[PDB]
């Protein structure tokens, strides 16, 4: 601070920082509440979404679908970035009121989605070794991976209920 320049060894004091008045904490005024919201916000409502999930196949492995949520998947031939993609085969759809169970699949159901990115997986070291034989191999592998965003689920209402009583 300023007077610290004059002696760089003199003790600091409280009065040099601010005056000794401090007009009010104002603990009831909203100003005391506003500054709390400035440095200490709250959670607030989460992002709304549709209360639904579904199962879908990509490649040969399965995934659980939630709208407004993304997930990594195996690489897709073509499928450029920002491309509108539709996943056809779905194994079930679930809601609070009902749960549609794909027979092998749900007829005429579809999952609209978007391609976020087209990236490579984190490196995994394929290392091979045989002791007392001077055999050592160090090979990495960056797997091709895509990043899909889900938008919504449609084409499932004509399926029966199979609900719970």
């Amino acid at each position: 601070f300023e007077e610290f320049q004059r002696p760089p060894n003199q003790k600091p004091q409280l009065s040099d920082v601010l005056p000794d008045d401090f007009q009010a904490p104002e603990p009831g005024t909203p100003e005391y509440n506003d500054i709390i919201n400035q440095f200490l916000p709250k959670k607030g409502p989460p992002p709304p979404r549709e209360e639904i999930f579904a199962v879908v196949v990509i490649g040969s492995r399965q995934y659980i679908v939630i709208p407004g949520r993304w997930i990594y998947t195996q690489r897709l031939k073509g499928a450029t970035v920002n491309d509108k993609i539709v996943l056809n085969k779905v194994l079930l759809v679930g809601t609070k009121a009902s749960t549609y169970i794909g027979t092998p699949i749900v007829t005429n159901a579809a999952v609209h989605a978007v391609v976020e990115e087209q990236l490579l997986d984190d490196k995994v070291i394929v290392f091979k070794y045989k002791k007392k034989k001077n055999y050592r191999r160090n090979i990495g592998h960056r797997q091709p991976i895509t990043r899909i965003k889900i938008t919504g689920i449609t084409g499932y209402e004509d399926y029966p209920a199979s609900t719970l009583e």
């Binding site: 709250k42 959670k43 989460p46 992002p47 979404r49 999930f53 659980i64 949520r69 997930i71």
Partner: protein, 200 residues
């Protein structure tokens, strides 16, 4: 301990740090009759396409289950097999080998346990000290008079896992000679028995 403005301040910040940590954290949901997800955890990590590993708030040891097993004319080993299934948590959908998701078990009338064949005079419970002559053999019936409870304990211990957790799983078993137990406040229930060979 010490009530000073310095140390008292330190306790006030951590209450505030835990509070701020609690707000932006995701609330924990109990497993009993829950839907797939909520609006809160939907913004969280992918607990759906990854295996569900339990949190510490799941196996809260206070609110665990409690069972009873009347050993009056019950087969030893077959009764011990199911007790391991219930203590280890293998019957629950929330099974995890590295976590105590199971439950408690109480045994009563241990001295009335059934035993097949001539094992009452042939089965040899034994132990060793460390000397070259510290071997002490003991029959079922001789042990049945001295300590009836080691019979049940020695059988279930061989069925529980061996390691840190298995030594921790053993204390969940309570065994008693008489037809009564002091664990009334916990409100236990009768244990089911899928097998049909246990009742002579």
């Amino acid at each position: 301990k010490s009530t000073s403005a310095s140390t008292k301040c330190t306790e006030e910040w951590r209450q505030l740090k835990e509070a701020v940590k609690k707000e932006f954290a995701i609330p924990h949901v109990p497993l009993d009759q829950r839907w797939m997800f909520t609006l809160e955890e939907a913004t969280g990590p992918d607990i759906w396409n990854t295996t569900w590993y339990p949190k510490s708030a799941d196996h809260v040891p206070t609110d665990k289950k409690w069972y009873v097993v009347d050993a009056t004319d019950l087969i030893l080993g077959r009764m011990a097999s199911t007790i391991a299934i219930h203590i280890r948590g293998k019957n629950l959908a929330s099974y995890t080998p590295s976590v105590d998701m199971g439950a408690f078990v109480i045994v009563v009338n241990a001295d009335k346990v059934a035993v097949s064949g001539k094992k009452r005079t042939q089965k040899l419970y034994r132990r060793h000290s460390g000397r070259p002559g510290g071997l002490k053999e003991e029959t079922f019936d001789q042990l049945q008079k001295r300590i009836p409870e080691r019979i049940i304990e020695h059988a279930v211990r061989g069925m529980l896992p061996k390691g840190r957790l298995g030594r921790y799983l053993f204390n969940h078993l309570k065994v008693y000679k008489g037809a009564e137990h002091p664990h009334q406040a916990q409100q236990p229930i009768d244990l089911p028995l899928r097998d049909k060979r246990i009742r002579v």
